[PDB]
Amino acid sequence: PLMVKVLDAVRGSPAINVAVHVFRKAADDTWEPFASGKTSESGELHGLTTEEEFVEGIYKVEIDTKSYWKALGISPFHEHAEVVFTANDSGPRRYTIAALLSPYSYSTTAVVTN
Amino acid sequence: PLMVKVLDAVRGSPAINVAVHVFRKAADDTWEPFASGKTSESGELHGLTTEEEFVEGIYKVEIDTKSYWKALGISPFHEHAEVVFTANDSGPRRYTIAALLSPYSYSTTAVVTN
Amino acid sequence: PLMVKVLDAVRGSPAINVAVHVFRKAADDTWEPFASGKTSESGELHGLTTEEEFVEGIYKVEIDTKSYWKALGISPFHEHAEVVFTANDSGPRRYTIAALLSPYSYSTTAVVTN
Amino acid sequence: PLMVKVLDAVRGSPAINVAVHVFRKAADDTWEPFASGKTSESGELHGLTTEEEFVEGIYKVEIDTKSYWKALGISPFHEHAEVVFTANDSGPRRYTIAALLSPYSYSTTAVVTN
Numbered sequence A, B, C, D: 001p002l003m004v005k006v007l008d009a010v011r012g013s014p015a016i017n018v019a020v021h022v023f024r025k026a027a028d029d030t031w032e033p034f035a036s037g038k039t040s041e042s043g044e045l046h047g048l049t050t051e052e053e054f055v056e057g058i059y060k061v062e063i064d065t066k067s068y069w070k071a072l073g074i075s076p077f078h079e080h081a082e083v084v085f086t087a088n089d090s091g092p093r094r095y096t097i098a099a100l101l102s103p104y105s106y107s108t109t110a111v112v113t114n
């Protein structure tokens, strides 16, 4: 139901071994840890959640971009990249969060399919 | 020392009347409100802070993209766009945070000058 | 060796049935048709070429964005999106050209892997 | 009536000294040279044309990204970034073409005002 894909705009490659933390907003407006992992050699992170657990609500996907750039020896601007969105039940729908990283910039999009 | 510029990729226009909230991480690791404003007819937000008040720190620039799209009658994907960065850690700099918005995507970059 | 992936930033979806034309630069500096097709329901276009035919050289990938937006009833800015690059033999390497489309903007990146 | 702004996503700076060539499609369907210039210290290129000369037409704004990256000692992916659009077909407009550059990626948008 939820996949993350991360690309590197400097090297033209998947962004490999990037830590990704997913949080769900709780009733008291705090961010509860939900799922996490590291991107694969294809820049993808699968297996974060299941349809049973991924209920409607507000989610935050935090991509640890600073550590990624530092491990490449490159000085980055952002602490991390944060993608915050609402999951809404609207028929069967898979969410892909994609991010394209540069040292001082990033782009993110959602691919939501049935 | 801190300016925000927001563009609309659907209309090919400045993103006008976008609310922007800036936070600064406090010594107890909470986000403290630091400044806020709205983008002008040119999509720019000036006057958020002064060189005196804009000390070293970790800052979060929250661009209220959902309220922007909904005020135009559009249901967007993201709750907001969040830009988090350490500022002024090598002395005062001037920061422009630019964002380019679509209903399911956004790109952000920083222009940092001395 | 060469794949094209096209995403829609307005709808948060693959860009389906987008015409894509690939050209190779000829010795007289003209653009010779090389391969073409339409993106699938996943926004992907596979099978454009083979390793035997995809020799080093300058290539142009033209994505017919204007017709895509017009078929959705949306007025776009660009005539098409053009991605021009050199293919260089540098060990075994697959090229993915990705593009993320909005009516007045697009982003493109290359994912080049072994 | 036509301005070009170019930013560097690796350095977080204006892209300075970027060559830009503008073409206009002629009645015989060839690209005729129309104007050219280079971006300034602020990453902006002004003065390309006048309201009198900038008639209706299909225009191509070629941003010489490869020479930019190579002059900085970097081997980039794309030959250039090409922005192709019909202009002034509903009367004179002011066009800003903005581009945000990385070695393997770029994003471009247009700001069109009346």
Ligand SMILES: Cc1n[nH]c(C)c1/C=C/c1cc(Br)c(O)c(Br)c1
Binding pocket: B005, B007, B096, B098, B099, B100, B107, B108, B109, B111, D005, D007, D096, D098, D099, D100, D107, D108, D109, D111
């Ligand atoms: C973010 C982003 N993503 N993609 C692009 C092409 C952009 C930035 C565009 C921009 C930034 C500034 Br500052 C400007 O003054 C103007 Br005009 C345009």
Ligand SMILES: Cc1n[nH]c(C)c1/C=C/c1cc(Br)c(O)c(Br)c1
Binding pocket: A005, A007, A096, A098, A099, A100, A107, A108, A109, A111, C005, C007, C096, C098, C099, C100, C107, C108, C109, C111
């Ligand atoms: C271009 C561009 N600009 N901005 C972003 C976030 C993109 C690329 C998104 C992308 C690329 C590939 Br290949 C995928 O498989 C998937 Br899913 C998504």
Ligand SMILES: *C(=O)c1c(F)cc(F)cc1F
Binding pocket: A013, A014, A041, A042, A043, C096, C111, C113
């Ligand atoms: C996505 O672009 C992607 C990779 F980065 C690597 C692969 F082996 C396959 C892919 F689709």
Ligand SMILES: *C(=O)c1c(F)cc(F)cc1F
Binding pocket: B007, B013, B014, B015, B041, B042, B043, D096, D111, D113
């Ligand atoms: C900045 O790019 C900008 C706009 F987007 C719109 C305007 F009317 C004036 C500007 F400077």
Ligand SMILES: *C(=O)c1c(F)cc(F)cc1F
Binding pocket: A096, A111, A113, C013, C014, C041, C042, C043
């Ligand atoms: C890429 O994002 C993508 C689609 F658009 C659709 C799919 F079924 C699978 C994918 F990886």
Ligand SMILES: *C(=O)c1c(F)cc(F)cc1F
Binding pocket: B096, B111, B113, D007, D013, D014, D015, D041, D042, D043
């Ligand atoms: C435009 O954003 C801009 C730069 F990128 C750099 C400068 F020094 C001045 C500018 F207006």
